[PDB]
Amino acid sequence: GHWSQGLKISMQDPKMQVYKDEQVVVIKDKYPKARYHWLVLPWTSISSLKAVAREHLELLKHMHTVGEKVIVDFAGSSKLRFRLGYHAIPSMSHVHLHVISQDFDSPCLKNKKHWNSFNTEYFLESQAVIEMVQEAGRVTVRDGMPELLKLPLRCHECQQLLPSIPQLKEHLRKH
Template sequence: MPVCWLVSEDDSHKPIQLHHHQTVTLGRGPKTKIKDKKCSRDQVELKADCNRGFISVKQLGVNATNVDNVVVGKGNQVTLKPGQRLYMVNQLYPYTVKFTEETSTPRPVGEESKSLKRPNQMSEDPAKKVSTTSHTDHHRITDGSPPPKKTPEACSDKSESAGHWSQGLKASMQDPQMQLYKDDRVVVIKDKYPKARYHWLVLPWESISSLKVLRSEHCDLLKHMQCVGDRMVQQCPDAHKLRFRLGYHAIPSMSHVHLHVISQEFDSPCLKNKKHWNSFTTDYFIESEDVVAMLEHHGKVTVKEGMSELLKLPLRCHVCRKEQSTIPKLKEHLKSHIS
């Protein structure tokens, strides 16, 4: 997967590596070589998202930290992307962020990653149970059995009715042929109708019907679900060349809470209509971190009114935002963004 580096523009010290989803505090001190006392020792808190290619910047110090010309403000948080500058304090000490490719497996991040090695988990590494061939045969468990053929009926909207999905999802959780990973809190399964080359679902064993019933006591569970999803991405053989997003549908058709882990090339025969596309490329798709933040700050998840209308929006490329008239034209256009 990509590796994140914070690079000093005045070349005063070596680039600082920021590990995926690991919080790092920087300011005045030997690591940055900054001696300016207007810069706090704990001036900024940084957290890299290597999959999505940005850093979250939170100002901790009293004096201003800037991202380009925008003052972050003490206690506030903004996003730093490649091409932007982070000024550590008072428009001084500029930094840029760079993402490079690394073929070696990243080390696990935090205690949640260790939970993936619990004694009662499946004996095999989840990544070893996933193989990719053509875009019609994704994520099958390598048990020697031939992959099921996807037919137009298998990818149809009728197969995705609420009742079918609700019952099918619960059955899939218990099906060893669908399971890619499991521990005592969650299970990861292949999405039966993947909307991209890689499309997995992380589900809790605990019966939770929807986002609406989540409360603050579920925070640890959702953080663990996100950690498991991140680990699946790290172990994906194409993680170094694909972007992934982790999130929830605002109004899911299934009755059991599930976290989508989906690659962003959207190369799948099951992505067939506007509803499919907009459910993953508009605000209808709520980032995992945003759901956790809502629970931490408000004790519940609030879904804005009118979310269903987002599914009717025009087809727009999620990379360049260019509008396309049909799904086939959109898919053809997407090829230009795949390296």
Template sequence: MALERRDVHWSHGLILELSKPQNWIAESENAVVIRDRYPKAMYHFLVVSKADILNIFELTRDDLPLLNEMFELALNLIFSKDRRLEEFKIGYHAEPSLLQLHMHVISTDFHSPTMKTERHWNSFNTQLFIPHEELMRRLMDYGRISKMDPRLIDELRMTQLKCNRCDRTEESIIHFKEHLKCHLIPFGKMAGWSLGLLNSLKDKSQWIISNTDAIVISDKFPKAKFHFLVLPRENISNIFQLTTDHLQLLNEMYLLAKNIIEIKGGEDDEFKIGYHAEPSMQQVHLHVISTDFNSPALKTKKHWNSFTTEFFVPHEELMRRLKADGKVAKLSSTTAKELLATPLKCHRCHATPKTMPDLKSHLLQHLK
């Protein structure tokens, strides 16, 4: 496909990559995904606009659909790699170095031989990096993206190196990169709380309701119109660490689940309340999800089957297992894969759509 562009506005690096469709990882109508030629982490991709837009400063409210399309490509890319969203930063540089509008999709390990300078680090870990949601908010509120004061840019570039996972600071990028290696083992399968849930537990502004034992937050990537997570304040990595000593805690979490349904004006039979048999986040969390499953974030067969097969363990069933056996047994990896690969089937009728787009179109019929 020939791309329309004013070559003077495109950095030579992007021109080279985009002129070779074989280098495109994914494509939509208005954007393509390529690998960053000098990745600053294990995973580092660019979602590049095909539209003739130099940078974020040329954006207007008319470009909001384009930005959403680019974000959808980013999400699909992460899911295709079997990674978790909280392992990535998705956004834009406040002072772009490439002259074609592009979104960074970068893993938060920042483990790469091309991560060489303080400037590299700070471009992703200070205000020099604008998360997608923040850029969208600014564009909707003000109709444009303002340039940052050059003096502030210089200050941010020289900010002291600070780890994105702990409070460690370093003066030397060499010593700093050595420190980052200590976080590589937990990356991708966090040994304690996942960063996303940990941040939510720290940030009380995200709490919807709470009691002395647990809190309720909105799922950041809801798979239905209403999708909440109930998190215990106690650090419990997953359901396999639960014992009969936790029965009271689980009941308190369930009461919060019922409470949030009532607050939202829902009925109990319009929601599923339960746990994933193989959790993707390493802090116990109870899903409270409406059965409409009407959400743009519901994208894959794995998403669907994680809530509509035995991969989803209802609260009552988990309590029964815990009381009977004193623990919750793990699924075999073979069984888990089989459940997630189950052919698509509507949870309200006998329809068996072949693809996710077909299923989502079918689900709309049940909303009428």
């Protein structure tokens, strides 16, 4: 479906370009799952994590550095915590780096898949991906990622199990 190309379309639209250089583009996540949620995409598209090889190393490092720069330039005075990583089995085409604040306070965060895709090992940290390409030369993704998306809701700050999304969002207010 044409919906899966949204990232390539949006990153080519100057009105959506939070940041741009000769290597990458940054856009706001159209349906953000937190107060701050950006996506970093390279101009030279990569199909999936399986296609990543050592030639992509510096680019991945650049995507990480740019993500941290966007935090400084557009959320510097914030005390929030941030994580940078990739979804093991994404839905939108063209690999993209998630840069998202750990409040997870947003109406677009609506279901269990949303939560677990940022708060389970389904969320592959950027620094860990960079490490695999630097040493092994490829990105290895363990099995069972679809099951992680169906796990009961667990708080990422205190590890408490919650029974529903609404009760989770109320719990997050304590942190």
